[PDB]
Design a protein around this ligand. Sequence first.
Ligand SMILES: CCCCCCCC/C=C/CCCCCCCC(=O)O
Length: 255
Amino acid sequence: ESADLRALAKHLYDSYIKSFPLTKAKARAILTGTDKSPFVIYDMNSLMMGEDKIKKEVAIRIFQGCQFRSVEAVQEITEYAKSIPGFVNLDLNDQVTLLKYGVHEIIYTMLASLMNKDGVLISEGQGFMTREFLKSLRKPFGDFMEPKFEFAVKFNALELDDSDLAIFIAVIILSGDRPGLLNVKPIEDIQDNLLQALELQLKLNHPESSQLFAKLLQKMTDLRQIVTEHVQLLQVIKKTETDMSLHPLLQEIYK
Ligand SMILES: CCCCCCCC/C=C/CCCCCCCC(=O)O
């Protein structure tokens, strides 16, 4: 019944707001236009004046900054996952598996919320780092954000809002096809109800957006490709910068 799907949609949106401090609605308010103006980092001096007003070569300091934020993001996504009805009742090994594969797909989905074609919000929206400053970073660190920006510009053209995204990232998490899952069926049963909820949600929230449900589902392909490229790029780092620490939570996820 639709009433149950609407209650599930409302539950997830509530947990999403409770779990993710910087929503898309806020990020768009910062990006579009007086109390919320971000300081803009577009070069070496702005970084310095940024590392002062926002608050060890620079390409590496920026890299380890991204890693720290990814870890914080894994923590937020883990919190959100526990609210998805049924998730914590699954075999503990399947919970770990679902988070291990799902977490970076969610990270780049939600990172799109903080992006426009020209750059990305950082430091809880207090800063804005330009796409060209990142693309200009020393090899191989300059190829690192560009595939995310390319995904975001397309993904953002779907014009989803946070309430849509709350259901979509839940769908992503309850993926029965992750390698090594022990009990695929109850995961699939949860995802099917989530899919029904998403379908109704896009119908009501975007009545004129034909086949938006299908187009959203097809984006789950671009997500997979970003991870694969990202994982390759890290292996290059591991060999060229043997002095660079990589956070253990991220190490474990990637293993
Ligand atoms: C310089 C301060 C933070 C700048 C962040 C720029 C983009 C914001 C978020 C980045 C997280 C995703 C980028 C890839 C992270 C590398 C480590 C990892 O998650 O495996």
